[PDB]
Short mmCIF file of C-alpha atoms in Angstrom, two decimals:
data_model
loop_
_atom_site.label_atom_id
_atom_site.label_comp_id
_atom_site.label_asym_id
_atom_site.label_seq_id
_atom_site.Cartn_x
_atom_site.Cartn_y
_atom_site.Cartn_z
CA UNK Q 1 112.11 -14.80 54.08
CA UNK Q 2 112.26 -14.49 50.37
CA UNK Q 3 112.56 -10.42 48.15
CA UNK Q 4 115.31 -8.51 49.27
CA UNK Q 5 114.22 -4.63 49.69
CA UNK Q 6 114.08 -2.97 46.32
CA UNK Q 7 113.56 0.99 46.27
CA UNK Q 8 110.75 1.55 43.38
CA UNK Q 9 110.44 5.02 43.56
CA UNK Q 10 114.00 7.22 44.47
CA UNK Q 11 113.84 10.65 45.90
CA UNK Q 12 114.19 13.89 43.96
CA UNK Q 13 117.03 16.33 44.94
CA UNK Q 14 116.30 19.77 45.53
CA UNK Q 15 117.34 23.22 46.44
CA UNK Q 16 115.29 24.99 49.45
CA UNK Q 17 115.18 28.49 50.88
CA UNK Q 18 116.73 29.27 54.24
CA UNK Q 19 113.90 28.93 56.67
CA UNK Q 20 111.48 26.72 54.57
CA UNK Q 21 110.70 23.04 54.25
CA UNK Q 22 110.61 20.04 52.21
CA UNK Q 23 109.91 16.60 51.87
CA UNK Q 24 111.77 13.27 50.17
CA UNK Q 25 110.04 10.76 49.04
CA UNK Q 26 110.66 7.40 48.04
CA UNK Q 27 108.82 4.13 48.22
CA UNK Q 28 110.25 0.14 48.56
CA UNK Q 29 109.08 -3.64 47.90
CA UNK Q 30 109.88 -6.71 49.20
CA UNK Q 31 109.34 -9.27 51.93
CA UNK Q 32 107.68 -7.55 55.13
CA UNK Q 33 108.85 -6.23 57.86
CA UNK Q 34 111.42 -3.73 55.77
CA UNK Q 35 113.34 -1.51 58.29
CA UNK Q 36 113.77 1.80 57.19
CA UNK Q 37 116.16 4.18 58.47
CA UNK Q 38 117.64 7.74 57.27
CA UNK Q 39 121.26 9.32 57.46
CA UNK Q 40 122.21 12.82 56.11
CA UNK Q 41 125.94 12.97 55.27
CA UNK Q 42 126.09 9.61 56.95
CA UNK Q 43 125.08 10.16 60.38
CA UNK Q 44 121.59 8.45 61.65
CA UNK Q 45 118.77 10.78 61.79
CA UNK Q 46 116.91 10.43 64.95
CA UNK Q 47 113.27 11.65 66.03
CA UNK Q 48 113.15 14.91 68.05
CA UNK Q 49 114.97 17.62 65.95
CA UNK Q 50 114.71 19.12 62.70
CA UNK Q 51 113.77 15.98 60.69
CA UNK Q 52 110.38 14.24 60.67
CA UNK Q 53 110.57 10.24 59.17
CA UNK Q 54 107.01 9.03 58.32
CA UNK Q 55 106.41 5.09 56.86
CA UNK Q 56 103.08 4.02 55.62
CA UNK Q 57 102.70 1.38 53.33
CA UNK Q 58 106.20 1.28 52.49
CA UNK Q 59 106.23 5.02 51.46
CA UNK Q 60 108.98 6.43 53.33
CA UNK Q 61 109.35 10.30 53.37
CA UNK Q 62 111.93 12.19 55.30
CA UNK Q 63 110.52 16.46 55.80
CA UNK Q 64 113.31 18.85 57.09
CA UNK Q 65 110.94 21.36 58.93
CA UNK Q 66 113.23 24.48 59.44
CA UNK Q 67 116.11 24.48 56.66
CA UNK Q 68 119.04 25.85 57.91
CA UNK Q 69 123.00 25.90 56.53
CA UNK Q 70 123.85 22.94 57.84
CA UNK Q 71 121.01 21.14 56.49
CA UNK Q 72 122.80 20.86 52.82
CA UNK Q 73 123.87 17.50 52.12
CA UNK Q 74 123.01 13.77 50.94
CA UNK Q 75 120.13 12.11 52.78
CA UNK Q 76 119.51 8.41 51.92
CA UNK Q 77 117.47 6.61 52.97
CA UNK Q 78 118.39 2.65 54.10
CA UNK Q 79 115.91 -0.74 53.99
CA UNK Q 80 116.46 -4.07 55.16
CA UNK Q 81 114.81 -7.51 55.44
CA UNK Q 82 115.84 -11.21 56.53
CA UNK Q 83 116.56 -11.34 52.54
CA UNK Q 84 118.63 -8.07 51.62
CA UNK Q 85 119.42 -4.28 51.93
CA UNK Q 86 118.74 -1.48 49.29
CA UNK Q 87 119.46 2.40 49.55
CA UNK Q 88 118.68 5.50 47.59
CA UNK Q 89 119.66 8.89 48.14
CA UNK Q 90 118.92 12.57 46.86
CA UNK Q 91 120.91 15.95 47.76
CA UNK Q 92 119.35 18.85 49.73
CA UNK Q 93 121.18 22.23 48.46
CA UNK Q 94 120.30 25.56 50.81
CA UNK Q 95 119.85 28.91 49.40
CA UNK Q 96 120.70 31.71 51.29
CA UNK Q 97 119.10 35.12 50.48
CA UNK Q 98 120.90 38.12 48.75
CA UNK Q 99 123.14 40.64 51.02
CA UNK Q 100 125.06 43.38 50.16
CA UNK Q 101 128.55 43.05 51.23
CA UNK Q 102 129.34 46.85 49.59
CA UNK Q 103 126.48 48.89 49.78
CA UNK Q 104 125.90 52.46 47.96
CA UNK Q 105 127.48 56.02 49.51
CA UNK Q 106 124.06 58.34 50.70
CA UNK Q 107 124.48 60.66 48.46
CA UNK Q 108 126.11 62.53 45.60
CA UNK Q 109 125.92 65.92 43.55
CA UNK Q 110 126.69 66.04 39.82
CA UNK Q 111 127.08 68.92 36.85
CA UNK Q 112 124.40 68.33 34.35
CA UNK Q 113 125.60 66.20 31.19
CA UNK Q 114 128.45 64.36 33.28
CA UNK Q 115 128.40 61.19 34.15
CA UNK Q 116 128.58 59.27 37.23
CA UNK Q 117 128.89 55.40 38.25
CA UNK Q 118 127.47 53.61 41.06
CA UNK Q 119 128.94 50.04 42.13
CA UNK Q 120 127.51 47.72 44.38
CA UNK Q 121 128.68 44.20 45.82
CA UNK Q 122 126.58 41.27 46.18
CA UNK Q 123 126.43 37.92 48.49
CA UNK Q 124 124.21 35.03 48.51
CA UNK Q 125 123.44 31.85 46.78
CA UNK Q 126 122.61 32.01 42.57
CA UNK Q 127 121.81 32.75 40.60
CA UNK Q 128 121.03 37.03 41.78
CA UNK Q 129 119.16 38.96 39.38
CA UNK Q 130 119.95 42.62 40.19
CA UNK Q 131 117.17 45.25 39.21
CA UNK Q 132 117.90 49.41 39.68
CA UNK Q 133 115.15 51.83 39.87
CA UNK Q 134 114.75 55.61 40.07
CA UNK Q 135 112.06 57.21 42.16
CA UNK Q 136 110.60 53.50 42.31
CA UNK Q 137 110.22 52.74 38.46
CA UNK Q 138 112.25 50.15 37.28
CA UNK Q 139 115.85 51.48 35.42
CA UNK Q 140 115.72 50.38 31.80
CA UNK Q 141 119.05 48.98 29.95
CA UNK Q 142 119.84 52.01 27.44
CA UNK Q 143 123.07 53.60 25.81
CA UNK Q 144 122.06 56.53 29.10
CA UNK Q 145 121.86 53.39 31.45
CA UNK Q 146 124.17 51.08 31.59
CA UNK Q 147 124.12 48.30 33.98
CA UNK Q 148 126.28 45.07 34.48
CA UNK Q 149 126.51 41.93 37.11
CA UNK Q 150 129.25 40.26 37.02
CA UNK Q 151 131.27 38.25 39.46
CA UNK Q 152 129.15 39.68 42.51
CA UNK Q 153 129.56 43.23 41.54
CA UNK Q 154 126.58 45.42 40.28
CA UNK Q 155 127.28 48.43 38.51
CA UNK Q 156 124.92 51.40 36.57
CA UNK Q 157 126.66 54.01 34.94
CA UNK Q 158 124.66 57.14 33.97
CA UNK Q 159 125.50 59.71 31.18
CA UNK Q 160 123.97 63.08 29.76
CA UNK Q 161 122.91 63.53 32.85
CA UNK Q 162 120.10 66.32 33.40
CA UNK Q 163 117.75 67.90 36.22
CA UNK Q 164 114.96 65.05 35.80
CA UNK Q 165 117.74 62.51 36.74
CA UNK Q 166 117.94 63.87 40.02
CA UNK Q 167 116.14 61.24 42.35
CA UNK Q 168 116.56 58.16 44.40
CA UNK Q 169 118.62 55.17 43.22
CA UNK Q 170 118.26 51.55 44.38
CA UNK Q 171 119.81 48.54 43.68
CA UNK Q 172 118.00 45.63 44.81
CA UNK Q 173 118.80 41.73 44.40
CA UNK Q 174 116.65 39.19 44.94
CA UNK Q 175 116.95 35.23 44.36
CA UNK Q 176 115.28 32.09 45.34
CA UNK Q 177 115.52 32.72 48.96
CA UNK Q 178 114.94 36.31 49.12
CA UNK Q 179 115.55 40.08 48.28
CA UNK Q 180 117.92 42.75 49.37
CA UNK Q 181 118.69 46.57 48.45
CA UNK Q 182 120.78 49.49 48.86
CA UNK Q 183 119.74 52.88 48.04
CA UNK Q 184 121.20 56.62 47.10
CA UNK Q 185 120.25 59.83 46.95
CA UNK Q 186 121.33 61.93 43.50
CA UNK Q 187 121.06 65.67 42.75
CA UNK Q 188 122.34 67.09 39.84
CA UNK Q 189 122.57 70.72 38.57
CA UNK Q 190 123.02 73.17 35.86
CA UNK Q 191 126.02 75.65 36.26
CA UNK Q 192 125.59 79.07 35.75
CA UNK Q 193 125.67 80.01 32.16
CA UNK Q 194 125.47 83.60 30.88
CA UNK Q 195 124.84 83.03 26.92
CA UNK Q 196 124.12 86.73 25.55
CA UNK Q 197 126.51 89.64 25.83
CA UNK Q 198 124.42 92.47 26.18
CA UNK Q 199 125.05 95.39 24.09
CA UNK Q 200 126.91 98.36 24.92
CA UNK Q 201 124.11 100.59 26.91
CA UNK Q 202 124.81 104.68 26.06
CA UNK Q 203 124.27 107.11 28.87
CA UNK Q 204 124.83 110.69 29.59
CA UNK Q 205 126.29 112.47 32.58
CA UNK Q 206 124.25 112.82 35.74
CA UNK Q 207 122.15 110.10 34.46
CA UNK Q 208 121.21 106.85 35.62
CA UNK Q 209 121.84 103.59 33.83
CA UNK Q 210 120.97 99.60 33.63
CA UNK Q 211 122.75 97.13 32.84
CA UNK Q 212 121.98 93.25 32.60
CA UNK Q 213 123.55 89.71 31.91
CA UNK Q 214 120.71 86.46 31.15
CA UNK Q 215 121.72 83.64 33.40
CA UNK Q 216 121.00 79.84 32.95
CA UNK Q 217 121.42 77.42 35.47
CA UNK Q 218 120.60 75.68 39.10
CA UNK Q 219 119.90 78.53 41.12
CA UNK Q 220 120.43 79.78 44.18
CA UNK Q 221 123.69 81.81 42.34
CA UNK Q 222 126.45 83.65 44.42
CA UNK Q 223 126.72 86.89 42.52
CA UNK Q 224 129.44 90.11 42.29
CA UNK Q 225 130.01 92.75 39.90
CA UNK Q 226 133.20 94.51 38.97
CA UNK Q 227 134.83 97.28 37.49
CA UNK Q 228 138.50 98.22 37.00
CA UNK Q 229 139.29 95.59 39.71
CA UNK Q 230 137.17 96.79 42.14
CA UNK Q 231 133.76 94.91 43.67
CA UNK Q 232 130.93 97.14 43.17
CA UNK Q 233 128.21 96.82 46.22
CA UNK Q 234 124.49 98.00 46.44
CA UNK Q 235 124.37 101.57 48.02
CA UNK Q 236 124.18 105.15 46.91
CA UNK Q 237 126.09 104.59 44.02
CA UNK Q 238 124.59 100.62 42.68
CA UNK Q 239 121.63 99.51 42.88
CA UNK Q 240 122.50 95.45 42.48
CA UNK Q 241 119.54 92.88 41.84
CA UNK Q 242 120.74 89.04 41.36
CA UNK Q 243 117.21 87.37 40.83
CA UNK Q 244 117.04 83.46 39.51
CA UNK Q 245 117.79 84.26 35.73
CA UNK Q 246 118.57 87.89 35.77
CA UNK Q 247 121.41 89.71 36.98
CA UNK Q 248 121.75 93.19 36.85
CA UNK Q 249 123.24 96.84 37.80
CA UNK Q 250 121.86 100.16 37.87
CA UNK Q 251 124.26 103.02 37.92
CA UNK Q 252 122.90 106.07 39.85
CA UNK Q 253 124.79 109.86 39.04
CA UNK Q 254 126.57 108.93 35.90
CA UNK Q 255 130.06 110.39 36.00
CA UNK Q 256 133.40 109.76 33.26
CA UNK Q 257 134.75 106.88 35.80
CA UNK Q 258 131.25 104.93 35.29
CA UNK Q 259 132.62 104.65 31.59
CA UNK Q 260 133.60 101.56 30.71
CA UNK Q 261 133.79 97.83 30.94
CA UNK Q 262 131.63 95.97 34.11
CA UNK Q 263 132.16 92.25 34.79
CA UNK Q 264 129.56 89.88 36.07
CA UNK Q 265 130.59 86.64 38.18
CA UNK Q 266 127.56 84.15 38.56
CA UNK Q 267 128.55 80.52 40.55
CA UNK Q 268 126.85 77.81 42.39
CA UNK Q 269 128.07 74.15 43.64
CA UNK Q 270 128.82 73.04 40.29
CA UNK Q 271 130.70 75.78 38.35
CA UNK Q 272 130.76 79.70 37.79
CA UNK Q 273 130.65 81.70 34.45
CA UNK Q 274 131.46 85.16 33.86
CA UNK Q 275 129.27 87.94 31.83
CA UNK Q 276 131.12 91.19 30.22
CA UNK Q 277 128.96 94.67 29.01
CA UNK Q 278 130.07 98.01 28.49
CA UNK Q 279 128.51 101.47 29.63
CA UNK Q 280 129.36 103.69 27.05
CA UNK Q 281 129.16 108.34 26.65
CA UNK Q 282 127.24 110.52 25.04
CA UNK Q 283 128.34 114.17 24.55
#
């Protein structure tokens, strides 16, 4: 009998995190006793479930104890007297945590100075910051790192790669609601690489003589040795040593069919090089 209901104070809208809570608040005048009631997306919301109504003083709140999915929507909140009716209402958005719908291959090998991209795809509510890290430290934008979201899809792509680059990726998103990641496994390696010819080595008959190629690279090395078509194996005749970063041939008994050019064939995973000396006569 006399102020209709007049909401003073409106609720706020806000976004929550799967799993947490929240409160809306709002508070009304007018002529006592105001009725106040709640719907979310229309429907009445009634004790017992996953919405808590409090009144005190005319401070209504409204606390959604567990948000899930289908908690998103408008809750308003209704008052009424002998004189009138009012109504406010705020919007409850859910965020749902990051997932990876495409995640990252184990593993991968790659030659030293290629370069090699990794692409990842990525769910869940915005906005997703994506981070990558090697070895645990945090990947850092560079023209050697180069990283992109966009549209869902996270991508590095790595050049110059080198031995020190060989590590553990991850790609991990995170957002309001929570954090996800995907992780790799990277070697790469230096092919074999003989940069020095030797020079000729001179000899004499019935003598014995070495010969040796300088190799670069990843090792363990697969190595053979050749002449005139023919592999040449450790026995009477060779004595063969294929160490790390050496490679080399000793020729026992020296005869005129020793003369002439050897070959050297050095290869691993990720290529194979070739290394060409001479045995040359005296007398």
């Amino acid at each position: 009998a006399m102020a209709p209901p007049f909401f003073d104070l409106k609720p706020v809208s806000v976004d929550l995190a799967l799993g947490e809570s929240g409160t809306f608040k709002c508070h009304v005048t007018g002529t006592a006793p105001i009725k106040i009631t709640w719907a979310k997306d229309n429907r009445e919301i009634r004790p017992g479930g996953n919405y808590k109504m409090t009144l005190v003083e005319n401070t209504a709140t409204l606390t959604v104890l567990k948000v899930t999915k289908g908690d998103a929507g408008q809750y308003t909140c209704y008052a009424s007297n002998v004189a009138g009716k009012d109504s406010c209402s705020a919007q409850l958005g859910v965020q749902e945590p990051p997932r990876f719908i495409k995640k990252l291959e184990p593993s991968r090998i790659v030659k030293q100075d290629e370069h090699t991209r990794y692409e990842c795809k990525i769910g869940g509510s915005p906005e997703i910051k994506v981070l990558w890290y090697k070895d645990e430290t945090e990947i850092q934008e560079s023209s050697k790192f180069r990283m992109s979201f966009v549209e869902s899809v996270a991508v590095l792509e790595m050049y110059n790669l080198s031995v020190e680059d060989s590590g553990d990726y991850t790609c991990e998103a995170h957002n309001a609601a929570g954090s996800a990641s995907s992780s790799t496994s990277l070697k790469v390696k230096e092919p074999p690489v003989f940069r020095k010819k030797p020079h000729p080595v001179e000899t004499l008959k019935g003598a014995d003589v070495h010969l040796e190629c300088e190799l670069q690279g990843t090792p363990p090395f697969q190595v053979s040795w050749h002449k005139d078509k023919r592999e040449l194996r450790s026995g009477k005749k060779y004595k063969i040593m294929s160490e790390n970063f050496l490679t080399s041939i000793h020729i026992l008994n020296v005869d005129s069919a020793d003369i002439g050019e050897y070959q050297c064939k050095a290869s691993n995973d990720v290529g194979s090089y070739t290394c060409v000396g001479s045995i040359t006569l005296k007398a």
